[PDB]
Amino acid sequence: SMQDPIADMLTRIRNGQAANKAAVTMPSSKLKVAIANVLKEEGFIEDFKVEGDTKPELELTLKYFQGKAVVESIQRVSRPGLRIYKRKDELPKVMAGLGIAVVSTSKGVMTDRAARQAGLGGEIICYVA
Amino acid sequence: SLSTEATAKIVSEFGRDANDTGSTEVQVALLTAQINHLQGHFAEHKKDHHSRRGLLRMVSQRRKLLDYLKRKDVARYTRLIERLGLRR
RNA sequence: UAGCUAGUAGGUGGGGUAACGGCUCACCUAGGCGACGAUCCCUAGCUGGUCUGAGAGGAUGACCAGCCACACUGGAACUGA
RNA sequence: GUAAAGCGCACGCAGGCGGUUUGUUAAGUCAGAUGUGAAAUCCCCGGGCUCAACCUGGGAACUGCAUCUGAUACUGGCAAGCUUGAGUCUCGUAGAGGGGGGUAGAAUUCCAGGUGUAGCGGUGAAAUGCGUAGAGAUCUGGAGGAAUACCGGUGGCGAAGGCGGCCCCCUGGACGAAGACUGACGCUCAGGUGCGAAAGCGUGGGGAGCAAACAGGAUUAGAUACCCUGGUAGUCCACGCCGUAAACGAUGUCGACUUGGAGGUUGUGCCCUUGAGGCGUGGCUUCCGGAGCUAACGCGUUAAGUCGACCGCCUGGGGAGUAC
RNA sequence: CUUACCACUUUGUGAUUCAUGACUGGGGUGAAAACAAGGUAACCGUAGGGGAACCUGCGGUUGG
């Protein structure tokens, strides 16, 4: 948003999930698209799609097992005000491995399992669960 | 309060073309004209305080625009602060 | 405790030192430090460690080991690696 | 919010934080390496003391620091943009927004006269104070100050304090419609700066009513009760000071997102091209209530929900917002 | 023998404390009716009167 557009996107996701909304939209960034890739390849959302050229818009599609949203929590971790960086041996297990941490590694934005595999840490973007 | 004709003259005389209303030179010239005239206003009455507040907004916004110029392009900034007489 | 500082900060020469150095001196320049806490006041040997705590932390620095400092108090040197 | 705790309100420097896309760098970050991280201690596996404590071997650990090599997502830098934030423009609307300048009446008291003579006056009760010397009221003109009854409001404007007769001059901000322009120019802000009810102060005035003080009467258990009767500061104006309020929504500022229903006020688009209209669409604003939140009360798209940036503040009651 | 520096020392002038001192400051000690409808809501700032704690003026609040 005004200062933290990535907590904006997570706030939109969890607000739209608690509102039982089918799809949320927000102004796109390339890192918004990166985290969206991580989520939709982890099965936390259905899909996304960025439309627009001068004003792209990221179209996340939320996902409900029945009447309950797939995401319970999604919390911003590193924010402007605390940046969080972890070495690969101290990357966080989110809900005992049942939920992901999306980290920003120097080989891109990946999940936490992927990062501790590839032996490189980085900036902890959020906890999804 | 400043007349439409005067704004047109200033937009011309500091604008890079006609109807470049929004560049920093145009913005600063309008703000400085308004500062001068209002300083005319508050000389006679010193005990108008609700209007003087709008004048502090004018002064503050004009300092912010001049700082943006200085940071962005020093050359146009230094041409302006005397080509309009500022930073006295 | 909000300003502090005239070897004060720097520079050139002398000198001095085992050695670099405002260390010292003569001249020159007029700086330097400070709200990222100078200055001033108060308290205090420092560490490995110890205790406590799930941890993060808190509290400590007896014994043992390492470093500092002191030797009635204040000065000073000599001798000597 | 009410338990302690949002500064009375702004503006604003430092500072903190910073939309988007490339490029670059490689500072943060991450990775590898290397060097160092004394021994003891702690921990693991053993060994010796008859066991244990204790001693001891090897290890691990020392979560750090530096250096080199590499990575480049992110943060920073540097460069170049972009246009969504922010602003400039063009045109209109509403408004107790403010400063000035005169302006008029209602009421207001005395005088200027007559009209009139036993009253005017008030409380728990008189009384004190007026009056028969003509007292009240009447109309008549004056004097002078205060404040602007209806409209008026569930209204409005303002950062807050707060702003209400009419009209002019100067002036501030807000909002709406399309369009153009700039091109992150932003947000928040310790310190700082400024505004800031009432009382008060100081300096000059003004003083129609009122009214702390003070002055008569009676109080009451005694009265310096209460009261009534006068009444001065003050109230009003100019300038300076004060800088405080339950300065309150007891709710910091800014942004984003999240079901509804009922209104009010002010724009504006489409279509009734009748004035409203019917359908939109903004801004402000009052009230219900959903999820959520809350100790509960409640709040609830103007959040006390869900978040992010920055600031202020709290840490049992009293002592005490007191002493120094 | 004599310069330069200097510890200490003496003086003055300063700051800073320590004690005690009348006093403080009088804390005293001893002596000269109504429970938000209820002798007059609950408060906030300010100014007055007085042994005060109260009352009154002026503005403000609902936490009546």
Side-chain angles (χ1 to χ4, degrees), chain A residues 3-4 76-85 123-125:
Chain A
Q3 287 177 48
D4 191 25
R76 190 75 208 274
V77 171
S78 167
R79 36 180 201 91
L82 271 297
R83 299 290 182 183
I84 312 287
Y85 309 104
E123 181 206 56
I124 316 287
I125 303 288

Side-chain angles (χ1 to χ4, degrees), chain A residues 112-123:
Chain A
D112 195 38
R113 183 177 292 171
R116 61 174 85 266
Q117 273 180 27
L120 73 165
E123 181 206 56

Side-chain angles (χ1 to χ4, degrees), chain A residues 27-43:
Chain A
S28 171
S29 68
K30 71 176 174 175
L31 183 138
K32 275 183 209 155
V33 178
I35 297 169
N37 296 115
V38 175
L39 297 164
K40 89 176 286 183
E41 65 183 1
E42 295 308 303

Side-chain angles (χ1 to χ4, degrees), chain A residues 1-5 7-8 11-12 14-15 19 21 29-31 54-55 75 79-80 83 85-88 104-109 119-123:
Chain A
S1 59
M2 183 177 176
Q3 287 177 48
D4 191 25
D8 204 355
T11 296
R12 295 212 198 214
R14 89 172 83 72
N15 283 9
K21 290 293 220 56
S29 68
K30 71 176 174 175
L31 183 138
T54 187
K55 296 172 179 307
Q75 273 315 297
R79 36 180 201 91
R83 299 290 182 183
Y85 309 104
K86 301 276 175 234
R87 298 185 326 121
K88 63 91 175 179
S104 183
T105 49
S106 184
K107 320 300 291 155
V109 182
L120 73 165
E123 181 206 56

